[PDB]
Amino acid sequence: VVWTDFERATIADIFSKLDYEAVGGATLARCLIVYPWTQRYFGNFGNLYNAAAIMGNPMIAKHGTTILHGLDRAVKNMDNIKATYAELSVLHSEKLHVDPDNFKLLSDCLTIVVAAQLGKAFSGEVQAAFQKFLSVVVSALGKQYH
């Protein structure tokens, strides 16, 4: 990936605006509610199939925070995302056998959570930079063939 100046500024600009606990918690809850089969991957996380149950779940809140800090590592290493995610990619395939469609579903949920928070500021140009970032992230998280 070759990043433009606008893109680098936008991406760090977005993350500097997000409360990782709030936003991460909301993103993960959103995914497990909108695409409820993703719940299978967290079967050891408790009360999980009523919707107020997912929103109230402290384990889900914690794991959503973990996701946002994982994304932060790519924000601070934007020219070296693949290497940064080498262990996470192994984890999500070899160990957890997550189907890669799910990375897109979660990415879309995060985008929607972000768009609601930022409002008018999340223009198409801004969204374009965010989605390029998520596409690099998802490509690095998926099983590596090369």
């Binding site: 929607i112 768009a115 198409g124």
Partner: protein
């Protein structure tokens, strides 16, 4: 299948957005074109692809009328969108991989203006609607 719950939720949204609907259509299409540039090839006629360009404005009204149609026809989307399904298969030959992209761009555009309507359970109802719309537009491919 959409529950009566999903259907109410979708119709109420479409009601709330009425004022701003032409704008929402124009902006979401703008988003699709800029965010997912693979989609530009279907529109290599338009002089300008910016939000504010008259062809983007006009076609945005056109998409939104197709969706208010889908809303009117929500009980049998396959029947109600047969002609638009045919058009997207044979006159255009749109890759149905693209249907999902427009849907997301519309959800994103709505989230920027109406954030309070986007609780997770409501988002779930809207996503089932747009998935059903895409399946309906995909009916006539084969």
């Amino acid at each position: 299948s959409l529950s009566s719950k999903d259907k109410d939720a979708v119709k109420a949204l479409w009601g709330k957005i009425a004022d701003k609907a032409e704008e929402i259509g124009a902006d979401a299409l703008g988003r699709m074109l800029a965010v997912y540039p693979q989609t530009k090839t279907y529109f290599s006629h338009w002089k300008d692809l910016s939000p504010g360009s008259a062809p983007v404005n006009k076609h945005g009204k056109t998409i939104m009328g197709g969706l208010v149609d889908a809303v009117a026809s929500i009980d049998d989307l396959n029947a109600g969108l047969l002609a638009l399904s045919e058009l997207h298969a044979f006159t255009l030959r749109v890759d149905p991989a693209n249907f999902k992209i427009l849907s997301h761009c519309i959800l994103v555009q709505l989230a920027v203006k109406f954030p309070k309507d986007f609780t997770p359970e409501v988002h779930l109802s809207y996503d089932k609607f747009f998935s059903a719309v895409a399946r309906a537009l995909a009916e006539k491919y084969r």
